[PDB]
Amino acid sequence: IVGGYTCGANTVPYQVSLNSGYHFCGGSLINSQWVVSAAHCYKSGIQVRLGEDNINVVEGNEQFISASKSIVHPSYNSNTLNNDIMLIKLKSAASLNSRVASISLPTSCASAGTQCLISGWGNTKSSGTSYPDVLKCLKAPILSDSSCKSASSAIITSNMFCAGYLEGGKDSCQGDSGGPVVCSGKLQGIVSWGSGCAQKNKPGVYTKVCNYVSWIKQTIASN
Ligand SMILES: COC(=O)[C@H](Cc1cccc(C(=N)N)c1)NC(=O)CNS(=O)(=O)c1ccc(C)cc1
Numbered sequence: 001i002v003g004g005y006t007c008g009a010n011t012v013p014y015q016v017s018l019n020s021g022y023h024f025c026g027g028s029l030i031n032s033q034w035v036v037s038a039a040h041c042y043k044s045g046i047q048v049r050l051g052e053d054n055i056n057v058v059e060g061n062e063q064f065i066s067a068s069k070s071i072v073h074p075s076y077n078s079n080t081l082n083n084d085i086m087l088i089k090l091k092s093a094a095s096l097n098s099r100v101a102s103i104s105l106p107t108s109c110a111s112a113g114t115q116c117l118i119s120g121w122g123n124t125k126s127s128g129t130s131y132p133d134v135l136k137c138l139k140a141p142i143l144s145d146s147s148c149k150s151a152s153s154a155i156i157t158s159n160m161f162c163a164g165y166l167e168g169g170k171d172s173c174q175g176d177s178g179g180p181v182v183c184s185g186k187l188q189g190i191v192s193w194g195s196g197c198a199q200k201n202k203p204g205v206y207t208k209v210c211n212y213v214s215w216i217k218q219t220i221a222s223n
């Protein structure tokens with residue numbers, strides 16, 4: 001996260017860290033046994049870490065649980081990042097409490113102008129690299145599709161939405177991928193892609209979760 005602030009230990013209880021010997025992606029706990037993340041974060045041998053703040057120090061509220069199954073969206077296109085979403089089932093249900101909680105799925109799609117909370121342990125520099133050990137937070141508004149396409153010229157599908165600032169300076173970054181974008185207490189997006197980080201007229205692009213609720217629900221019900 002670039003231009004954000006330190007969230008505070010466990011103030012974002014649904015945030016998870018995907019670890020394969022090191023943190024490589026974020027994720028969101030949607031219930032005691034399932035996590036949602038980005039399809040481009042797919043990898044075998046994933047361990048989910050819950051209740052994390054400083055990912056390099058055992059602080060006492062963590063739950064480390066291995067994944068038993070990973071399900072990338074059937075229509076994920078790695079070239080365009082369309083349908084960049086994946087579900088991860090935990091080998092065992094996590095113990096939910098004040099520091100480890102799930103985030104609800106949306107019942108409707110959020111509108112441009114809505115303020116959302118984005119979080120992660122990704123790079124904090126727009127130029128060069130500097131990885132924080134504690135969770136960073138960023139408040140950012142959903143941008144209109146027209147204002148976005150008009151700025152980045154990049155290809156934005158109906159399963160994506162831009163959030164951030166066209167002036168640059170604040171944005172999600174490398175290592176934040178798969179992380180949550182929460183608006184109105186519901187999971188509305190997943191950190192997906194962008195051109196560099198916090199560059200002017202290059203806002204972050206997120207997976208539009210409201211379009212996948214049916215798939216998520218059905219998949220969780222049969223797996
Ligand atoms: C990959 O390294 C990076 O610094 C960022 C990471 C990232 C991830 C998720 C969201 C954001 C964000 N800004 N909100 C940033 N992405 C890039 O810089 C990618 N742009 S890119 O134009 O460099 C590019 C595009 C496609 C390929 C195969 C490789 C590189």
Ligand SMILES: [Ca+2]
Binds near residue numbers: 053055060062
């Ligand atoms: Ca820790």
